[PDB]
Design a protein around this ligand. Structure first.
Ligand code: HEM
Ligand SMILES: N[C@@H](Cc1c[nH]c2c(Cl)cccc12)C(=O)O
Ligand SMILES: [C-]#N
Length: 350
């Protein structure tokens, strides 16, 4: 049914299959060292595979992204025990900055590195803790990432489709079906991840580190390019400064292509602004306008079926401070309000 997912999943799998530093058996030893709080051991383990003589000249994006993944788990780990990795591992920061340059991404691990670029097998999957709850946390993102990426493409495509066309309702229906994967992610997370273990055992690994004289956030599903999708769909012309600062916070952490999608649509009417202007001009007597707006309302419905339960998941974990993305759960309440207001516009048009 979700035929667009496969190409995105295949692009991730290429990085997941890559082990340019031959580090697989080494990174598997990291969870034991974290459990023992063995900081010298963690450093010594990293230095067994950390390149010292620069990056191999044959490397492309895939090899450099894979290398950042493997070094990356050591970054959150070191910071988790109270140490700036750049300060306790000499020669590390030049390597991180070279890998940032090679990938056009930040100089540390991101969500992409620890989830979809990370192999799934028990004898290969990299992990901070090796805990079952961390395994399910990674899985919860793998459920929806490729489907979200397809949904971004569908949103960009829908932007150029007239509400007067039967194509509008059909593309919106298709978009809704990809966005349902976000809901599936949260259901999975609510069922399989203990909030207690998350807060006590996992969360400490997601603190910011300093590289290149600035601070970079640790991995979080907050880094998924959902905010780019909604920037195009409804948010691009919002004047809420807090919402704007939220989006611009994560921009460095998403694929270059999605930064470029974000830039293309900024300061310009969002999809629903255009769609509603068109509905106003043409009238809801037009059958394709009615169907298009109805299909559009269902898109907001699924966003809200993600966002509202996700808020409860987050509050439950913090019932045991701010996330890895740097916000308290109250920001989530604000984004949720914005989403209801956007759905409200669509439904008043009907
Ligand atoms: C134990 C599990 C989780 C907790 C405790 C949690 C908590 C949070 C927190 C505190 C934020 C605010 C930003 C920050 O400071 O990090 C956030 C944002 C966000 N998270 Fe999660 N989260 C969890 C799982 C997930 C999952 C499984 C997904 C999707 C697969 C997800 C997707 C998002 C998105 C898209 C945002 C941006 C805000 C929004 O779009 O509503 N999170 N989360
Ligand atoms: N940003 C949220 C949840 C979170 C941190 N790391 C994550 C990862 Cl690696 C996957 C999914 C969610 C999270 C928090 O820091 O509590
Ligand atoms: C959720 N990060």
């Amino acid at each position: 049914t979700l035929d667009r997912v496969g190409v995105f999943a295949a692009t991730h799998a290429a990085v997941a299959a890559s082990d340019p530093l031959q580090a697989r058996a080494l990174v598997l030893q990291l969870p034991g060292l974290n459990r023992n709080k063995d900081v010298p051991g963690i450093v010594g383990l990293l230095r067994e595979f950390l390149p010292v003589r620069g990056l191999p000249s044959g490397w492309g994006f895939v090899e450099a992204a894979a290398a950042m993944r493997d070094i990356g788990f050591f970054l959150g780990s070191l910071k988790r025990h109270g140490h700036e990795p750049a300060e306790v591992v000499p020669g590390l920061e030049p390597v991180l900055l070279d890998l940032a340059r090679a990938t056009n991404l930040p100089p540390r691990e991101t969500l992409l590195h620890v989830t979809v670029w990370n192999p799934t097998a028990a004898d290969a999957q990299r992990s901070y803790t090796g805990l079952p709850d961390e395994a399910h946390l990674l899985e919860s993102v793998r459920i929806s990432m490729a489907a979200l990426e397809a949904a971004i493409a569908l949103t960009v495509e829908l932007f150029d489709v007239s509400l007067r066309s039967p194509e509008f309702a059909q593309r919106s229906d298709e978009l809704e079906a990809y966005l349902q994967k976000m809901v599936e992610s949260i259901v999975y997370a609510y069922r399989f991840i203990s909030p207690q273990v998350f807060y006590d055992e996992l969360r400490p690994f997601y603190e910011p580190i300093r590289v290149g004289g600035q601070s970079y956030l640790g991995p979080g599903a907050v880094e998924m390019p959902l905010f780019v999708l909604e920037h195009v769909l409804w948010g691009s012309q919002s004047d809420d400064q807090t919402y704007r600062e939220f989006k611009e916070t994560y921009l460095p952490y998403v694929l270059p292509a999605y930064r470029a999608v974000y830039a293309r649509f900024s300061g310009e009417p969002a999809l629903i602004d255009r769609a509603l202007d068109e509905a106003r001009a043409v009238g809801t007597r037009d059958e394709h306008v009615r169907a298009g707006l109805t299909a559009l309302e269902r898109v907001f419905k699924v966003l809200l079926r993600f966002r509202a339960p996700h808020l409860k998941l987050a509050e439950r974990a913090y019932e045991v401070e701010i996330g890895s993305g740097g916000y308290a759960p109250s920001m989530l309440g604000e984004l949720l309000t914005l989403t209801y207001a956007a759905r409200s516009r669509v439904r008043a048009a009907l």
